[PDB]
Each structure stands twice: as C-alpha cells, then as structure tokens.
C-alpha cells in the first residue's frame, strides 16, 4: 500500500503540479512582450499630430 | 466564500472598472479633433474679410 501511493501520488503529480522553472521562463516573456507592447501603444498615440502642421 | 468574492469582483471589475489603455487613445483623438476645429474655426472666422476689397 505504501509503494502504491508513493507511485500515484508520482503520477497524480507529473500532470497537475507545475514546472516552476518553464512558468518562469513564460512569465518573463510575457512580461517583456507586455512592456514592449505599452510602449508601442504610447508611441502610436502620438502619431497623428503630424498633421496638426499642417493647419 | 473568498473563491466566490474574488470571482464576484472580477465580474464586477470587468464591467464598471474603465480600461486605461482602451480610453487613452480616445482622449488624444478627441483632443486632436478639438484642435483641428479650433484651427479651422479661426480660419472662418477671418473667411469674410476677402469682401472688404471690393468697398
């Protein structure tokens, strides 16, 4: 009985637990994309007042 | 209950809770349009001075 459960908690725990390290690894991309993509958002908000010199 | 409150403010935030990001762009449309007739309504204003020529 021991062996057994030792086995399935093994199992039980290859699908649900996570893998710390290769949701860190994700977390940080995203992170970096997130940024990324604010910046680029502030900078296409100041793109139409190019026409403003023309008025 | 703190499951059910947190998933309750979620659903409540998801609704009254304004998206900055969303509402930013908006705004500096808006000012832009703001600008462009404020521009364009000085230039009317001083359209009928061209008569003045033929007095």
Redesign the interface.
């Known amino acids: 009985l021991m062996n057994a459960y030792e086995n399935t908690q093994a199992s039980e725990s290859r699908i649900r637990d996570a893998d710390m390290a290769e949701e860190t690894v994700a977390f940080t991309k995203n992170q970096i994309l997130v940024q990324s993509g ?1 910046a680029m ?1 502030a900078q ?3 793109r ?2 190019g026409v ?1 010199s023309l ?1």
Chains 1, 2 share one sequence.
């Open positions: 604010t958002l296409a908000n100041v139409p007042q403003l008025l």
